[PDB]
Amino acid sequence: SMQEEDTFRELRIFLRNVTHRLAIDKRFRVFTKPVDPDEVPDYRTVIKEPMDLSSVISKIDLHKYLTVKDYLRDIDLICSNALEYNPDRDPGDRLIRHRACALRDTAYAIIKEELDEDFEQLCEEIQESR
Ligand SMILES: COC(=O)N1C[C@@H]2C[C@@H]3O[C@]2(Cc2[nH]cnc23)C1
């Protein structure tokens, strides 16, 4: 219905606003673009599904997310990719892991304060009807 297409348009406006607020935070610059395959050639042999905040906006505009749950699966993949590629005790690996955990925790905290639980349940019920 038109009403259902209006629901998904509100979901996309909400997701673009959360993603912009993450992308302007200086702590998260290392997640604003794909890991460069010329600078890091072993990256795409270790990490089987690369993800970053530029790719997330492209996916919102392609209508890939029909719930906040499917958006948070991609924020969780950015975080898990950084923990698995950079696992060592040295400071550069510890700094990127701390930033990855802060990106995940920040996204979940904005959604807990600003997403209405009944708006998410409406998106889930339209998705399950298709
Ligand atoms: C999310 O970003 C990462 O997982 N990274 C892996 C790399 C390791 C380290 O930071 C890079 C880029 C780079 N070039 C030279 N060393 C590095 C970004």
Side-chain angles (χ1 to χ4, degrees), residues 1-25 27-130:
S1 65
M2 182 75 268
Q3 310 93 266
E4 288 169 344
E5 292 310 307
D6 284 350
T7 300
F8 297 130
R9 208 170 300 113
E10 178 162 353
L11 173 67
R12 296 186 302 266
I13 292 164
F14 175 71
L15 295 179
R16 296 196 193 83
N17 179 261
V18 173
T19 306
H20 182 248
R21 290 152 65 190
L22 298 173
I24 67 176
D25 188 304
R27 293 173 290 172
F28 307 146
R29 201 189 174 286
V30 76
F31 311 109
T32 61
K33 301 188 307 208
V35 173
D36 190 295
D38 300 315
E39 168 184 29
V40 195
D42 112 302
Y43 190 74
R44 281 171 185 72
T45 76
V46 177
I47 298 299
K48 299 304 177 185
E49 193 172 2
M51 190 50 63
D52 67 280
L53 297 172
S54 196
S55 295
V56 168
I57 300 166
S58 290
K59 289 187 66 170
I60 297 166
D61 291 347
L62 287 168
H63 308 194
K64 299 276 187 177
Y65 308 118
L66 277 75
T67 66
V68 183
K69 184 172 276 83
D70 286 354
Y71 167 91
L72 287 172
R73 291 191 234 279
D74 274 347
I75 300 301
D76 288 326
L77 182 58
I78 297 175
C79 181
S80 67
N81 288 345
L83 308 185
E84 299 161 4
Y85 191 74
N86 308 281
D88 292 351
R89 71 101 30 213
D90 59 272
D93 289 14
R94 284 181 168 167
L95 177 62
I96 201 164
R97 295 204 306 277
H98 191 268
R99 292 168 164 179
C101 287
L103 174 78
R104 178 197 66 202
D105 291 350
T106 300
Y108 277 81
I110 292 169
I111 287 162
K112 185 185 191 174
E113 287 199 315
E114 300 179 30
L115 170 64
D116 192 306
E117 64 180 9
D118 293 337
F119 180 85
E120 177 65 359
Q121 183 69 32
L122 175 59
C123 289
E124 291 180 16
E125 292 181 5
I126 304 166
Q127 174 185 62
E128 173 65 29
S129 82
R130 301 228 150 155

